Amino acid sequence: QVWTPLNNKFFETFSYLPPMTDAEISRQVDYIVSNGWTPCLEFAGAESAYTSNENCVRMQNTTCLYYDNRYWTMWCTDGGQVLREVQACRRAFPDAYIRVVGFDPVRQVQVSGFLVNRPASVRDYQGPSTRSV
Amino acid sequence: QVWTPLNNKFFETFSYLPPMTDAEISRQVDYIVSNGWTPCLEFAGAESAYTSNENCVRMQNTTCLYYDNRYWTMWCTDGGQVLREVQACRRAFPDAYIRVVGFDPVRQVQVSGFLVNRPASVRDYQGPSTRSV
Amino acid sequence: LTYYTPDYQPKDTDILAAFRMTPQPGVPPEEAGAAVAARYKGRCYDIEPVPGEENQYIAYIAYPLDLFEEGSVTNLFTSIVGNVFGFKALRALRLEDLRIPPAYVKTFQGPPHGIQVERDKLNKYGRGLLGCTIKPKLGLSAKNYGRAVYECLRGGLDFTKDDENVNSQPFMRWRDRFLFVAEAIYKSQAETGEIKGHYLNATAATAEEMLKRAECAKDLGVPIIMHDYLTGGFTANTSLAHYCRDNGLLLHIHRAMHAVIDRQRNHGIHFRVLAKALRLSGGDHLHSGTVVGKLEGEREVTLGFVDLMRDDYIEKDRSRGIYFTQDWVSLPGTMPVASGGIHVWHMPALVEIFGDDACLQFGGGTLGHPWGNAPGAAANRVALEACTQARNEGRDLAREGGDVIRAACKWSPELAAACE
Amino acid sequence: LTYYTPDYQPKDTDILAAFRMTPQPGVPPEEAGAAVAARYKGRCYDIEPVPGEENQYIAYIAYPLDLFEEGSVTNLFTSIVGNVFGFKALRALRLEDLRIPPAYVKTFQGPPHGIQVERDKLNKYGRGLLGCTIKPKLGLSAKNYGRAVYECLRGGLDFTKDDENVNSQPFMRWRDRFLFVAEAIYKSQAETGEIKGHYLNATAATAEEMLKRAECAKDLGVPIIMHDYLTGGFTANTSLAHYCRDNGLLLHIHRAMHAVIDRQRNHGIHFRVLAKALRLSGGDHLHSGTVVGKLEGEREVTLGFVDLMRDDYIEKDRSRGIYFTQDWVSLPGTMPVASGGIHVWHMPALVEIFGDDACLQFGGGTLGHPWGNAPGAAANRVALEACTQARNEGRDLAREGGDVIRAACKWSPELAAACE
């Protein structure tokens, strides 16, 4: 079989697994909470979801390690609350990818980041069986 | 007559001849095999088929000899097998240009590269008689 | 003995070394420790015999901080192990550990970015990184090397790397390889939407040539380069690490020629000291182990030097080979890179042993997947993500790795052709 | 004779020269060879008479490797042919061949990219390259020069080139020409989708000016420049070749003033020695022959120097003029460029003689096509591709070239107006 290079976009962690269900998202959020970390939600439409070099035109010397759309837009006690917020974000922005992020409150660093929602309207991604043709 | 500059794209070797038939492709693949070389198939959709300078925005000093879309996507014993793979690639990706590549197994260098398929859907190319207006 | 002072209490600024030495018969251990030790004099303050070994002792040496040049791993190694392995009075001698006082640590820049800055720059969290060594090792043209890089990266791999002996040869000059690899990296980035990279080998004959290759990588905008620090030298490595910090480049470190110094148990320098010297000199990644069949070497020793090269504060643990408490005073950590034959069903073990802050390298070049390079990379990525997800759910990977692999294979056609 | 040693066996590191000399009457051949030869002494080790010539002999001279400066074609030519053509004892003298030992070859960088790297960079495989010389030779403004370049390239030609005498004149300054040619190259690339190029002449009065022109070409991102090595000098050529390797530029070499040294059979230096000196100094292309009517010169001699400038290992073949086995130890090959009146029906002969690794140049400026420059370029491209396809099918081009041309013309309106 051949890995398809057409409409096969991916979003880093857990993006190569089948779309996670509510129970799986809940278990991941519980894992984040268990470690002592804070979960939050990021979202972006299809125009600002993938990495790009749009602003590299303004730079000189080098553009090493600079990529656009690394930041998404921010949307935290347990899995159920984060799931409710996931549904709320889905209703508010149906054409936007949702990403669950984790933040270590002591080190003040991001420790987690996995996609939990892919807009049905957008078709820039494949499915577990359509990834190979 | 005037060489048309509208929708007259070309793909290097054998691109200025009329579209090759199955027998002609087979004879070319047999020529590649006779020399001791390995034939393979490359394919690309219309968005990544022609050379471009999209990533030159990330570079400084010089961009000499750098062009995008020089690489296509990879898709090998005799002409018949490569022809069967050509039909398989056509069925799997009907809107993609297919290119037969040759690789010298001893020198480990590419020795061949000719287009064998032009997607009917795409109209960025002319025909042997429509090349001049 | 003026140089054996068992009542001496080491200062907070002393550099401490733990030597495992086997003196010649008739030489008392106190005399041998005094010799190794011999205001600016090194002194043996502690000698312990090794229970279960033949005439083997651990000698603890204290060096004053004024003895060394600030921020110079070269000087540190010249002072500590310059001419001490050639003493006739010692049948065998092995440096086991070093204690770098914070006062000395603060004089070093350290790794250019570290683990957390690397994760933030690459926007990859919660999982180990994946890499492949482009194979065949040599003979491939820059074009074909780039084609292999693009094929492996588009599958889902985060990194690819040049072979350790690929610097600049008649078959493939370095600038052609850099250009073709840059095109491949950018194509794979556009196709997958994830940030990709390739460990471009900057190791060269002269520091000027090495800096020129780093400069070319910086001008292409590519993320990361590679260096052979034990063959290029600490002086060359430190220059490259300073350059990478200045210009925002990641630095992968390969430990070529390491077994010539850290293989024999009785003679040489233990890899943990070389890992601490690398972290001081600078490196974002450091090839730290091989997985032939399984992770080779005592697990505790591996865990010890992985913690030593990762954490900020490592307490003394003789079980794992930590002879001294090591405070890193906020020096950036180095990401360990486990390479070799990482088979798909062996991923759960390595994920359990290393965790998320490591790079698993398929130095075998993969190619074992019947479909191609790209599906093989996808299978590996699927397996790693499935193992990580299972571990996050509370599963015991060492007991359910096969079950997790099978369950992932049930829905992954690419992994199905890999699991067979 | 201390300098004639017929029992001497040349070393693996000796530089060997084969001189064709006609001594004055009364001078024995052994004495003349001894004179040409005269630890660091050159010696005549072999003399053979030329069967079928008047008092003509081939003298083989062996020079020690320590005599020459590493990587210096200038020094090599100063040592070998500095002051030996002025000997009164020789009626005529002609250097026929050189043997460059691998030890010496390794001290040279060689061509910046070579044939295979050129093909990979340009993404053109399986066929010869095509070029045109913009005509009229002189008087054209930079704007009109660029217009002609764009018109010829859009037709299907892979290259265009500045006239040999076009460097920088009141009628067309060099920077205006570079800018307009860059615009034309980019327009033709966008229109056809194939990578295009133009041999920009960097030949200048001072090395500084030549490097400035190369720098402008590098800043425009254009692929290739041109140099006149026999008029500019080996020192200037070597500087340009090093620059082109450093900055990723292709280098086309034109052999202006060559006939002043390689035309007469009895006196001078044979072109094959100049071709080997060019390959050592550096050049990706080297104008190697003219096709007035047909490829001029003995075919075997042409094939010999084409193989000498292309292959990695050329065995001694006196039939083709190879006096010594030449090992190139993986030095990049130089692409021969056959220029002149390449008419459409003469393409099969040149495709058969040269193969795919050559550039056919329409130095006549084409213009013979009644429709225009672009359709004429297309006709040429169609003819070349048809001949290549026929050759790949097993056809004998030397016998079926007309049939192949007619068959291609049956479907090509552009070639129909060209074949008439």
Side-chain angles (χ1 to χ4, degrees), chain A residues 56 59-67 70, chain B residues 58 60, chain C residues 121 186 214-224 247-250:
Chain A
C56 282
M59 302 195 218
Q60 327 285 355
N61 197 46
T62 198
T63 63
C64 293
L65 291 193
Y66 182 91
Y67 306 94
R70 273 184 302 202
Chain B
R58 293 185 60 77
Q60 327 285 355
Chain C
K121 291 292 189 57
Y186 289 147
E215 170 107 353
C216 174
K218 161 223 194 172
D219 287 0
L220 290 167
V222 294
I224 187 160
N247 299 281
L249 271 172
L250 298 174

PDB file of all heavy atoms in Angstrom, chain A residues 56 59-67 70, chain B residues 58 60, chain C residues 121 186 214-224 247-250:
ATOM      1  N   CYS A  56       7.747  34.764   7.550  1.00  0.00           N
ATOM      2  CA  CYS A  56       9.181  34.696   7.302  1.00  0.00           C
ATOM      3  C   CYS A  56       9.646  35.758   6.317  1.00  0.00           C
ATOM      4  O   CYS A  56      10.843  36.048   6.259  1.00  0.00           O
ATOM      5  CB  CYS A  56       9.562  33.312   6.781  1.00  0.00           C
ATOM      6  SG  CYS A  56       9.671  32.046   8.049  1.00  0.00           S
ATOM      7  N   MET A  59      11.634  38.702   7.925  1.00  0.00           N
ATOM      8  CA  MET A  59      12.797  38.383   8.734  1.00  0.00           C
ATOM      9  C   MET A  59      14.060  38.287   7.896  1.00  0.00           C
ATOM     10  O   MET A  59      14.022  37.956   6.710  1.00  0.00           O
ATOM     11  CB  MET A  59      12.588  37.085   9.491  1.00  0.00           C
ATOM     12  CG  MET A  59      11.383  37.143  10.371  1.00  0.00           C
ATOM     13  SD  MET A  59      11.346  35.832  11.581  1.00  0.00           S
ATOM     14  CE  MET A  59       9.610  35.506  11.530  1.00  0.00           C
ATOM     15  N   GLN A  60      15.168  38.570   8.571  1.00  0.00           N
ATOM     16  CA  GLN A  60      16.477  38.464   7.898  1.00  0.00           C
ATOM     17  C   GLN A  60      17.343  37.537   8.742  1.00  0.00           C
ATOM     18  O   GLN A  60      16.799  36.915   9.676  1.00  0.00           O
ATOM     19  CB  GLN A  60      17.123  39.846   7.803  1.00  0.00           C
ATOM     20  CG  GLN A  60      16.126  40.984   7.631  1.00  0.00           C
ATOM     21  CD  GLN A  60      15.550  41.066   6.238  1.00  0.00           C
ATOM     22  OE1 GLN A  60      15.941  40.330   5.335  1.00  0.00           O
ATOM     23  NE2 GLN A  60      14.615  41.983   6.050  1.00  0.00           N
ATOM     24  N   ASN A  61      18.625  37.453   8.421  1.00  0.00           N
ATOM     25  CA  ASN A  61      19.596  36.642   9.146  1.00  0.00           C
ATOM     26  C   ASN A  61      19.251  35.159   9.098  1.00  0.00           C
ATOM     27  O   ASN A  61      19.968  34.375   8.472  1.00  0.00           O
ATOM     28  CB  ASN A  61      19.715  37.122  10.594  1.00  0.00           C
ATOM     29  CG  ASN A  61      20.964  36.615  11.272  1.00  0.00           C
ATOM     30  OD1 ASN A  61      22.052  36.671  10.710  1.00  0.00           O
ATOM     31  ND2 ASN A  61      20.814  36.123  12.492  1.00  0.00           N
ATOM     32  N   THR A  62      18.171  34.760   9.766  1.00  0.00           N
ATOM     33  CA  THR A  62      17.756  33.365   9.763  1.00  0.00           C
ATOM     34  C   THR A  62      16.287  33.276  10.144  1.00  0.00           C
ATOM     35  O   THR A  62      15.722  34.201  10.730  1.00  0.00           O
ATOM     36  CB  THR A  62      18.610  32.524  10.719  1.00  0.00           C
ATOM     37  OG1 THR A  62      18.477  31.139  10.385  1.00  0.00           O
ATOM     38  CG2 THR A  62      18.179  32.735  12.153  1.00  0.00           C
ATOM     39  N   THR A  63      15.672  32.148   9.782  1.00  0.00           N
ATOM     40  CA  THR A  63      14.328  31.799  10.228  1.00  0.00           C
ATOM     41  C   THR A  63      14.307  30.446  10.926  1.00  0.00           C
ATOM     42  O   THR A  63      13.248  29.821  11.029  1.00  0.00           O
ATOM     43  CB  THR A  63      13.332  31.801   9.064  1.00  0.00           C
ATOM     44  OG1 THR A  63      13.694  30.793   8.114  1.00  0.00           O
ATOM     45  CG2 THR A  63      13.298  33.153   8.379  1.00  0.00           C
ATOM     46  N   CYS A  64      15.459  29.981  11.402  1.00  0.00           N
ATOM     47  CA  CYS A  64      15.549  28.673  12.036  1.00  0.00           C
ATOM     48  C   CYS A  64      14.640  28.596  13.253  1.00  0.00           C
ATOM     49  O   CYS A  64      14.643  29.489  14.104  1.00  0.00           O
ATOM     50  CB  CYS A  64      16.991  28.384  12.446  1.00  0.00           C
ATOM     51  SG  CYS A  64      18.141  28.185  11.086  1.00  0.00           S
ATOM     52  N   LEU A  65      13.860  27.510  13.339  1.00  0.00           N
ATOM     53  CA  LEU A  65      12.973  27.250  14.512  1.00  0.00           C
ATOM     54  C   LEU A  65      11.813  28.250  14.590  1.00  0.00           C
ATOM     55  O   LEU A  65      11.157  28.287  15.645  1.00  0.00           O
ATOM     56  CB  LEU A  65      13.812  27.200  15.796  1.00  0.00           C
ATOM     57  CG  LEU A  65      14.738  25.987  15.890  1.00  0.00           C
ATOM     58  CD1 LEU A  65      15.289  25.814  17.296  1.00  0.00           C
ATOM     59  CD2 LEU A  65      14.016  24.724  15.447  1.00  0.00           C
ATOM     60  N   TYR A  66      11.563  29.023  13.531  1.00  0.00           N
ATOM     61  CA  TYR A  66      10.391  29.880  13.501  1.00  0.00           C
ATOM     62  C   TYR A  66       9.361  29.280  12.558  1.00  0.00           C
ATOM     63  O   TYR A  66       9.660  29.025  11.389  1.00  0.00           O
ATOM     64  CB  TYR A  66      10.719  31.307  13.057  1.00  0.00           C
ATOM     65  CG  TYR A  66       9.488  32.184  13.078  1.00  0.00           C
ATOM     66  CD1 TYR A  66       9.149  32.905  14.210  1.00  0.00           C
ATOM     67  CD2 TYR A  66       8.638  32.252  11.982  1.00  0.00           C
ATOM     68  CE1 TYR A  66       8.015  33.687  14.241  1.00  0.00           C
ATOM     69  CE2 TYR A  66       7.500  33.021  12.008  1.00  0.00           C
ATOM     70  CZ  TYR A  66       7.196  33.741  13.136  1.00  0.00           C
ATOM     71  OH  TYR A  66       6.066  34.516  13.155  1.00  0.00           O
ATOM     72  N   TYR A  67       8.152  29.080  13.065  1.00  0.00           N
ATOM     73  CA  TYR A  67       7.039  28.609  12.260  1.00  0.00           C
ATOM     74  C   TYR A  67       5.774  29.300  12.741  1.00  0.00           C
ATOM     75  O   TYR A  67       5.601  29.541  13.934  1.00  0.00           O
ATOM     76  CB  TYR A  67       6.878  27.087  12.344  1.00  0.00           C
ATOM     77  CG  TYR A  67       8.126  26.318  11.995  1.00  0.00           C
ATOM     78  CD1 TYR A  67       9.010  25.910  12.982  1.00  0.00           C
ATOM     79  CD2 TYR A  67       8.427  26.005  10.679  1.00  0.00           C
ATOM     80  CE1 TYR A  67      10.154  25.215  12.668  1.00  0.00           C
ATOM     81  CE2 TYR A  67       9.567  25.309  10.356  1.00  0.00           C
ATOM     82  CZ  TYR A  67      10.426  24.916  11.355  1.00  0.00           C
ATOM     83  OH  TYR A  67      11.565  24.218  11.040  1.00  0.00           O
ATOM     84  N   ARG A  70       2.018  27.907  15.273  1.00  0.00           N
ATOM     85  CA  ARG A  70       2.330  27.056  16.415  1.00  0.00           C
ATOM     86  C   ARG A  70       1.410  27.376  17.583  1.00  0.00           C
ATOM     87  O   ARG A  70       0.962  26.474  18.297  1.00  0.00           O
ATOM     88  CB  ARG A  70       3.796  27.216  16.812  1.00  0.00           C
ATOM     89  CG  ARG A  70       4.740  26.310  16.050  1.00  0.00           C
ATOM     90  CD  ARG A  70       6.160  26.436  16.553  1.00  0.00           C
ATOM     91  NE  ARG A  70       6.645  27.804  16.463  1.00  0.00           N
ATOM     92  CZ  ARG A  70       7.924  28.144  16.428  1.00  0.00           C
ATOM     93  NH1 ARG A  70       8.880  27.234  16.485  1.00  0.00           N
ATOM     94  NH2 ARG A  70       8.251  29.426  16.326  1.00  0.00           N
TER      95      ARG A  70
ATOM     96  N   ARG B  58      12.229  31.274   3.242  1.00  0.00           N
ATOM     97  CA  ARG B  58      12.903  30.880   4.470  1.00  0.00           C
ATOM     98  C   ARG B  58      14.419  30.924   4.365  1.00  0.00           C
ATOM     99  O   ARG B  58      15.099  30.582   5.335  1.00  0.00           O
ATOM    100  CB  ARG B  58      12.477  29.469   4.875  1.00  0.00           C
ATOM    101  CG  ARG B  58      11.031  29.346   5.295  1.00  0.00           C
ATOM    102  CD  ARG B  58      10.731  27.947   5.791  1.00  0.00           C
ATOM    103  NE  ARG B  58      11.547  27.603   6.946  1.00  0.00           N
ATOM    104  CZ  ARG B  58      11.321  28.035   8.179  1.00  0.00           C
ATOM    105  NH1 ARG B  58      10.288  28.810   8.459  1.00  0.00           N
ATOM    106  NH2 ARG B  58      12.155  27.687   9.149  1.00  0.00           N
ATOM    107  N   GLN B  60      18.354  32.533   3.152  1.00  0.00           N
ATOM    108  CA  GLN B  60      19.154  33.764   3.001  1.00  0.00           C
ATOM    109  C   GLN B  60      20.361  33.412   2.140  1.00  0.00           C
ATOM    110  O   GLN B  60      20.382  32.296   1.587  1.00  0.00           O
ATOM    111  CB  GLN B  60      19.612  34.255   4.374  1.00  0.00           C
ATOM    112  CG  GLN B  60      18.619  33.974   5.493  1.00  0.00           C
ATOM    113  CD  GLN B  60      17.422  34.893   5.472  1.00  0.00           C
ATOM    114  OE1 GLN B  60      17.337  35.823   4.674  1.00  0.00           O
ATOM    115  NE2 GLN B  60      16.482  34.643   6.370  1.00  0.00           N
TER     116      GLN B  60
ATOM    117  N   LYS C 121       9.841  24.560  20.747  1.00  0.00           N
ATOM    118  CA  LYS C 121      10.170  24.979  19.358  1.00  0.00           C
ATOM    119  C   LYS C 121       9.522  24.012  18.363  1.00  0.00           C
ATOM    120  O   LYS C 121       8.996  24.486  17.340  1.00  0.00           O
ATOM    121  CB  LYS C 121      11.687  25.007  19.149  1.00  0.00           C
ATOM    122  CG  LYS C 121      12.436  26.099  19.898  1.00  0.00           C
ATOM    123  CD  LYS C 121      12.134  27.490  19.392  1.00  0.00           C
ATOM    124  CE  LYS C 121      13.047  28.539  19.991  1.00  0.00           C
ATOM    125  NZ  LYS C 121      14.474  28.225  19.742  1.00  0.00           N
ATOM    126  N   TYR C 186      11.238  20.435   3.749  1.00  0.00           N
ATOM    127  CA  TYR C 186      10.138  21.361   3.512  1.00  0.00           C
ATOM    128  C   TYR C 186       8.965  20.678   2.821  1.00  0.00           C
ATOM    129  O   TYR C 186       7.804  20.971   3.132  1.00  0.00           O
ATOM    130  CB  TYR C 186      10.635  22.557   2.712  1.00  0.00           C
ATOM    131  CG  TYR C 186      11.523  23.453   3.535  1.00  0.00           C
ATOM    132  CD1 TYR C 186      12.574  24.143   2.960  1.00  0.00           C
ATOM    133  CD2 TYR C 186      11.321  23.587   4.899  1.00  0.00           C
ATOM    134  CE1 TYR C 186      13.387  24.955   3.717  1.00  0.00           C
ATOM    135  CE2 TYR C 186      12.127  24.393   5.660  1.00  0.00           C
ATOM    136  CZ  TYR C 186      13.157  25.076   5.065  1.00  0.00           C
ATOM    137  OH  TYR C 186      13.962  25.880   5.829  1.00  0.00           O
ATOM    138  N   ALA C 214      27.544  24.775   9.588  1.00  0.00           N
ATOM    139  CA  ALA C 214      26.490  25.262  10.472  1.00  0.00           C
ATOM    140  C   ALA C 214      25.839  26.515   9.905  1.00  0.00           C
ATOM    141  O   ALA C 214      24.623  26.699  10.011  1.00  0.00           O
ATOM    142  CB  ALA C 214      27.054  25.537  11.863  1.00  0.00           C
ATOM    143  N   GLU C 215      26.644  27.391   9.307  1.00  0.00           N
ATOM    144  CA  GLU C 215      26.132  28.613   8.705  1.00  0.00           C
ATOM    145  C   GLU C 215      25.223  28.310   7.525  1.00  0.00           C
ATOM    146  O   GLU C 215      24.199  28.972   7.340  1.00  0.00           O
ATOM    147  CB  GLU C 215      27.301  29.496   8.277  1.00  0.00           C
ATOM    148  CG  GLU C 215      26.912  30.671   7.424  1.00  0.00           C
ATOM    149  CD  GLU C 215      26.988  31.969   8.183  1.00  0.00           C
ATOM    150  OE1 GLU C 215      27.216  31.923   9.410  1.00  0.00           O
ATOM    151  OE2 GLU C 215      26.819  33.037   7.560  1.00  0.00           O
ATOM    152  N   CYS C 216      25.588  27.325   6.704  1.00  0.00           N
ATOM    153  CA  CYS C 216      24.712  26.916   5.609  1.00  0.00           C
ATOM    154  C   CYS C 216      23.387  26.380   6.136  1.00  0.00           C
ATOM    155  O   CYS C 216      22.321  26.692   5.595  1.00  0.00           O
ATOM    156  CB  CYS C 216      25.400  25.860   4.744  1.00  0.00           C
ATOM    157  SG  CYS C 216      24.355  25.147   3.447  1.00  0.00           S
ATOM    158  N   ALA C 217      23.438  25.562   7.188  1.00  0.00           N
ATOM    159  CA  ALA C 217      22.203  25.062   7.782  1.00  0.00           C
ATOM    160  C   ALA C 217      21.343  26.204   8.307  1.00  0.00           C
ATOM    161  O   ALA C 217      20.118  26.191   8.159  1.00  0.00           O
ATOM    162  CB  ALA C 217      22.520  24.077   8.902  1.00  0.00           C
ATOM    163  N   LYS C 218      21.974  27.197   8.932  1.00  0.00           N
ATOM    164  CA  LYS C 218      21.244  28.364   9.410  1.00  0.00           C
ATOM    165  C   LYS C 218      20.623  29.145   8.256  1.00  0.00           C
ATOM    166  O   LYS C 218      19.495  29.637   8.364  1.00  0.00           O
ATOM    167  CB  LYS C 218      22.176  29.250  10.230  1.00  0.00           C
ATOM    168  CG  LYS C 218      21.697  30.667  10.407  1.00  0.00           C
ATOM    169  CD  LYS C 218      22.823  31.657  10.231  1.00  0.00           C
ATOM    170  CE  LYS C 218      22.434  33.022  10.743  1.00  0.00           C
ATOM    171  NZ  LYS C 218      23.590  33.955  10.762  1.00  0.00           N
ATOM    172  N   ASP C 219      21.341  29.247   7.134  1.00  0.00           N
ATOM    173  CA  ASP C 219      20.842  30.023   5.964  1.00  0.00           C
ATOM    174  C   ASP C 219      19.692  29.278   5.279  1.00  0.00           C
ATOM    175  O   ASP C 219      18.841  29.956   4.677  1.00  0.00           O
ATOM    176  CB  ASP C 219      21.987  30.374   5.012  1.00  0.00           C
ATOM    177  CG  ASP C 219      22.894  31.460   5.565  1.00  0.00           C
ATOM    178  OD1 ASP C 219      22.625  31.930   6.689  1.00  0.00           O
ATOM    179  OD2 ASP C 219      23.857  31.832   4.868  1.00  0.00           O
ATOM    180  N   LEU C 220      19.664  27.946   5.354  1.00  0.00           N
ATOM    181  CA  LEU C 220      18.538  27.202   4.808  1.00  0.00           C
ATOM    182  C   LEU C 220      17.306  27.237   5.706  1.00  0.00           C
ATOM    183  O   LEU C 220      16.219  26.884   5.246  1.00  0.00           O
ATOM    184  CB  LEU C 220      18.951  25.754   4.551  1.00  0.00           C
ATOM    185  CG  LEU C 220      19.927  25.565   3.392  1.00  0.00           C
ATOM    186  CD1 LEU C 220      20.525  24.175   3.409  1.00  0.00           C
ATOM    187  CD2 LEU C 220      19.237  25.845   2.073  1.00  0.00           C
ATOM    188  N   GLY C 221      17.442  27.649   6.962  1.00  0.00           N
ATOM    189  CA  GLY C 221      16.323  27.661   7.880  1.00  0.00           C
ATOM    190  C   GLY C 221      15.961  26.318   8.466  1.00  0.00           C
ATOM    191  O   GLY C 221      14.924  26.207   9.123  1.00  0.00           O
ATOM    192  N   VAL C 222      16.775  25.294   8.238  1.00  0.00           N
ATOM    193  CA  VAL C 222      16.515  23.949   8.739  1.00  0.00           C
ATOM    194  C   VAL C 222      16.696  23.946  10.252  1.00  0.00           C
ATOM    195  O   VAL C 222      17.410  24.799  10.792  1.00  0.00           O
ATOM    196  CB  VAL C 222      17.419  22.915   8.051  1.00  0.00           C
ATOM    197  CG1 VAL C 222      17.068  22.808   6.583  1.00  0.00           C
ATOM    198  CG2 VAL C 222      18.868  23.276   8.229  1.00  0.00           C
ATOM    199  N   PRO C 223      16.067  23.026  10.972  1.00  0.00           N
ATOM    200  CA  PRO C 223      16.052  23.120  12.436  1.00  0.00           C
ATOM    201  C   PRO C 223      17.303  22.657  13.177  1.00  0.00           C
ATOM    202  O   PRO C 223      17.637  23.260  14.200  1.00  0.00           O
ATOM    203  CB  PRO C 223      14.846  22.250  12.812  1.00  0.00           C
ATOM    204  CG  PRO C 223      14.713  21.300  11.717  1.00  0.00           C
ATOM    205  CD  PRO C 223      15.125  22.008  10.480  1.00  0.00           C
ATOM    206  N   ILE C 224      18.006  21.621  12.713  1.00  0.00           N
ATOM    207  CA  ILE C 224      18.945  20.904  13.571  1.00  0.00           C
ATOM    208  C   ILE C 224      20.161  20.426  12.783  1.00  0.00           C
ATOM    209  O   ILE C 224      20.077  20.130  11.589  1.00  0.00           O
ATOM    210  CB  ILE C 224      18.225  19.722  14.269  1.00  0.00           C
ATOM    211  CG1 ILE C 224      19.124  19.039  15.298  1.00  0.00           C
ATOM    212  CG2 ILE C 224      17.699  18.732  13.250  1.00  0.00           C
ATOM    213  CD1 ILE C 224      18.366  18.231  16.320  1.00  0.00           C
ATOM    214  N   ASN C 247      22.441  31.302  17.153  1.00  0.00           N
ATOM    215  CA  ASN C 247      21.666  31.362  15.924  1.00  0.00           C
ATOM    216  C   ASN C 247      20.388  30.536  15.973  1.00  0.00           C
ATOM    217  O   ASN C 247      19.716  30.398  14.949  1.00  0.00           O
ATOM    218  CB  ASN C 247      22.544  30.939  14.751  1.00  0.00           C
ATOM    219  CG  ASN C 247      23.732  31.853  14.577  1.00  0.00           C
ATOM    220  OD1 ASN C 247      23.611  32.942  14.028  1.00  0.00           O
ATOM    221  ND2 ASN C 247      24.884  31.426  15.066  1.00  0.00           N
ATOM    222  N   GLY C 248      20.026  30.010  17.136  1.00  0.00           N
ATOM    223  CA  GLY C 248      18.793  29.259  17.285  1.00  0.00           C
ATOM    224  C   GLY C 248      18.739  27.944  16.540  1.00  0.00           C
ATOM    225  O   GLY C 248      17.726  27.643  15.903  1.00  0.00           O
ATOM    226  N   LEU C 249      19.804  27.155  16.602  1.00  0.00           N
ATOM    227  CA  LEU C 249      19.854  25.837  15.987  1.00  0.00           C
ATOM    228  C   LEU C 249      19.921  24.765  17.066  1.00  0.00           C
ATOM    229  O   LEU C 249      20.588  24.942  18.087  1.00  0.00           O
ATOM    230  CB  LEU C 249      21.065  25.713  15.063  1.00  0.00           C
ATOM    231  CG  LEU C 249      20.914  26.118  13.600  1.00  0.00           C
ATOM    232  CD1 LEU C 249      22.266  26.111  12.932  1.00  0.00           C
ATOM    233  CD2 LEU C 249      19.976  25.174  12.886  1.00  0.00           C
ATOM    234  N   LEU C 250      19.233  23.652  16.797  1.00  0.00           N
ATOM    235  CA  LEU C 250      19.321  22.490  17.711  1.00  0.00           C
ATOM    236  C   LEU C 250      20.614  21.745  17.376  1.00  0.00           C
ATOM    237  O   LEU C 250      21.093  21.883  16.235  1.00  0.00           O
ATOM    238  CB  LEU C 250      18.092  21.599  17.514  1.00  0.00           C
ATOM    239  CG  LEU C 250      16.741  22.245  17.823  1.00  0.00           C
ATOM    240  CD1 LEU C 250      15.602  21.315  17.437  1.00  0.00           C
ATOM    241  CD2 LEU C 250      16.644  22.608  19.295  1.00  0.00           C
TER     242      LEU C 250
END
